[PDB]
Amino acid sequence: LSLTADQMVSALLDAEPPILYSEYFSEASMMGLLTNLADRELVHMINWAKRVPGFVDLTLHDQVHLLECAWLEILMIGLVWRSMEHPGKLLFAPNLLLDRNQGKCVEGMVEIFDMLLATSSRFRMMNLQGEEFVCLKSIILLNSGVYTKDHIHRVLDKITDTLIHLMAKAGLTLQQQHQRLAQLLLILSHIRHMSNKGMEHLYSMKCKNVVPLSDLLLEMLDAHR
């Protein structure tokens, strides 16, 4: 709002949720672990959202809408970030580092694993920075449900300013700044795609009683159909 670029970055960095652990595999047990983790992460996600500058200035109705829309995108970009320095693997948790082929343990999962791994590869290629990552995650929260207004578009502009500030600080030329900004935002289209796909997969797992899902996770899934 009246934050400076560095203030915005520090605030987003401070607001970061913790990295959670799993338990120290059939379809049922892997889906169990992943959905148990997701549920626990969601509780921290809600707290993080309240610390994204501008978010609590929104109505409760809007806060609910944005989180219900964005939650899987947000879990996924977190996963991809965690996984960046682990080529070919997904670091769901520090004690749950899954190779690409372990995705085959759940029907329909390997295709989603491949999309996530490709995203992690793309971040690695771009040398995505932590400060850029937290900007992107906030943009996902504020953007993904916003057409379904002006104060939010102002906050979104401020985060764009913050990304550009980071790139200028890194020594990028004007041309390089705009190109990199575009590269980063285009990855959000891919994160949306993966979330759409992941949502259908979870739904399908829900229908099959493959796995007990928490009330919270059921309500978050439910918002999408």
Partner: peptide, 11 residues
């Protein structure tokens, strides 16, 4: 109320 709605206010 969904869980979310309360949690969003819980201090």
């Amino acid at each position: 109320h969904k869980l979310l709605h309360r949690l969003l206010q819980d201090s």
